[PDB]
Structures are given as C-alpha cells and as structure tokens.
Amino acid sequence: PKSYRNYSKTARNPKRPFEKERLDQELKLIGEYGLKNKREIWRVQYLLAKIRSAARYLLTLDEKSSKRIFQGEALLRRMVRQGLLGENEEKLDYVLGLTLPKLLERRLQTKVFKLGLAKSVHHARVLIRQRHIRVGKQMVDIPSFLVRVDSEKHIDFATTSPFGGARPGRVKRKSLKKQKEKTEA
Template identity: 55%
Template sequence: MPVAQSWVCCKTYVTPRRLFEKSHLDQQLKLISEYGLRNKREVWRVKFTLAKIHKAAQEMLTLDEKDPRRLLEGNALLRRVVGIGVLDERKMKLDYILGLKIEDFLDTHKLGLNC
C-alpha cells in the first residue's frame, strides 16, 4: 500500500492590485532585464518575501528591547537575513532590515548566492 504524502501549500507570491499600471510595469521590466529573471512572478515572489521579513522586523521593533520574544525571534530573523546574503554581518540590527530593498535580494540572485 502506498503511503499518502501530505502537501503543504502556501502562498509564494502576491500579484499587484493594478497589474497594468505603467509605473509598475516599467519597474518590473527593468528588474527582469537587469537581473535575468524569467518572468514577473519571480519579481512578485521576491517582493512578497521582502514584505514578510519587513513585517516581522516591524513587529519585533514594537516590543520592548528586553522582551525575550524580541531577543529570540529578532536574532533568528537577523541570522536568516545574513544567511541569505542580503544583510552584512556588521549591520545585524532590526533597523537595517527595514532599509532593505528588492534590489538587495536580487543582487544575491545575480551573484548566485541563493540557488
């Protein structure tokens, strides 16, 4: 008897509210051509990942500095971002995470650091 596999499906990208807005289209096409992406879905995926990281950093910054949750989860978030290669080890603070841009993530893609 075959064993049933469970699939965990979660969102990997979010489409923009206005797909055909000229400013969004120009920005996406520029990113696709500059970083060698296959399609706009890859741009949306990176934006979604960046938004999740920003949201987690904002939530950690609202907590007290001595809060154990902020210490534990904040350090885990920082290690994750440094491990991806987006943030430099000298800038291991939650404030620097809020300053990250989509180009920082795509630079690691261009260098081949994330496979």
C-alpha cells in the first residue's frame, strides 16, 4: 500500500509576474538580509499569512468565549516565546501588526551577524554552513534556523571548530608541514 507519511508545501507564487514596485521591494529585502532567491521571501510570507488568518478569525469571535480564550492564549504564548511581540503588547491586536522584517530578523544568520562574531551577513551565512556555530551545546548549520527567546544568549563557536579552540584546518597544517621539511632539510 501507499505509505502513510504525508507532506505539504511552504511557498506560493505572486500571481502577477512583472509588477515593478513589488520586485524592487523584494530586491531591497534580499540585499539587506543576504538571501539567495525570492523563494525565501515567499516562504516567510506564507507563514505570516497563516498567523494573520488565525488572528483574524479569533478576533471576529465573541469575548469571554471558551474557544477564543483557549486558542488566543495559546497563540499569544507562542508568539511571545518566539520573540515577536514582547512584554507590553500581548493583546491579539498586535498580531495583525507583525511585518515581514520582524520575522526575518530572527534568523540565525542575522543573529550571528548582529552579535559581532562576523564581519558581514554573507560572512555570517558562510560560517554557519561550514560547521563553526553552536546554539547551546548543539551544533547548527542551517541559516533559516529561527532563534527562540531563551536561546539567544547561548550562540557561540563550536568546540570542534578552529575558531573555537581546536586543531587548525587542512591549509594551516600543510603550510606548517612544508615549513618543517624546509627547516629540517
């Protein structure tokens, strides 16, 4: 029989292929955050649309209703845990105000750049992909990793990295070798 493991899509196409202002805004964001394609912009838009749809449906509902209370508390807790709302704007109306830069600010790439630790955002992307970064004693090499609130003070170099207290790489050791056989010949 067919397998029982299912799957789903994460992006959606703009429906209007050659609109000038949207295209310019997309290039803005891609250049600012150092991304690869339009597909990443579209995945973030997809996620934000799901969030906003849930918030709208909850808001049209009656006050002191059990459904609203349960699901609104769950959604607000999830949002504040993600680091998108804060401390004094947890009221289910500030959900509708979340914009694209807010979500895009929580990527491990942006966080690695902003905390010193890298000279740019392209440097930040290349370091993550080369096994140099940890998030709390677990090594992460995926630049779309979204950092939660209580995990953002634990970003640091990895113990197995030459930038984090280990042996040097394949280039240093070969140069040192050539120097050794130079000085002992």
